[PDB]
Structure 1
Amino acid sequence: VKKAHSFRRKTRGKLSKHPRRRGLPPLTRFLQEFEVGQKVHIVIEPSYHKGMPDPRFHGRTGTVVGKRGDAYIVQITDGGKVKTFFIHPVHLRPQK
């Protein structure tokens, strides 16, 4: 039986947490700041459902190109295409 892709298909592990986190993250993540051109890792936090990208791109590294609202604009290169996302800083982590 062929099954279409959806937001939460095969996410049992990818969007779980070690039972010792089990709650709100420390607040230095919600209050991050990045600059245009900075490289960021995409690391989804499963307790915040706002500003969350397709989990297919969990584990990738992109670059910041701008800002809209409280969300940052992140560009990735999927194969030979550029894709643009508006992601909340709680799902991001800087490279070095």
Structure 2
Amino acid sequence: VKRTHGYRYKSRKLLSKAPRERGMSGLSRLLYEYKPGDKVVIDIDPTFISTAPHRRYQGKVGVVIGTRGRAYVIETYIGDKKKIIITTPEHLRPHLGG
């Protein structure tokens, strides 16, 4: 039977947490202020799944283009196609590697 494609269709491992990470996450990711040109890493937080980007963007590095209210507009790539991810900071981490 063909693969089904719901928005979260092969995400058991990705959305699972170890026992020591159970419960609410810390709030420091909320407090980073990103400006255009900043580099961020998409690190999905499973306790806020409805605002999380698609599983294909986990671990990708994007560039902040701007803000939309409280979300950040991030320019990234899936293979060769440019993608625009709009997401809240709880699903973002600063990329220190350049």
TM-score by length of 2: 0.90
CA RMSD of aligned residues (A): 1.2
CA distance in 2, matches of 1:5, 1:39: 30
Partner SS state of residue 83, structure 1: strand
What does residue 49 of structure 2 align with? 49
Query: What are the residue-to-residue correspondences of 1:1-96 with 2, within 5 Å?
Result: 1-96=1-96
Unaligned runs of 5+ in 2: none
Q: Given that residues 42 and 58 in structure 1 are in contact (C-alpha distance below 8 angstroms), is that contact kept between their aligned partners in structure 2?
A: yes
Amino acid at match of 1:23: G
Question: Runs of at least 4 residues of structure 1 off by over 4 A?
Answer: none
TM-score by length of 1: 0.91
Amino acid at match of 2:28: T
Count of matched residue pairs = 96
State the identity as a percent.
43
Unaligned runs of 5+ in 1: none
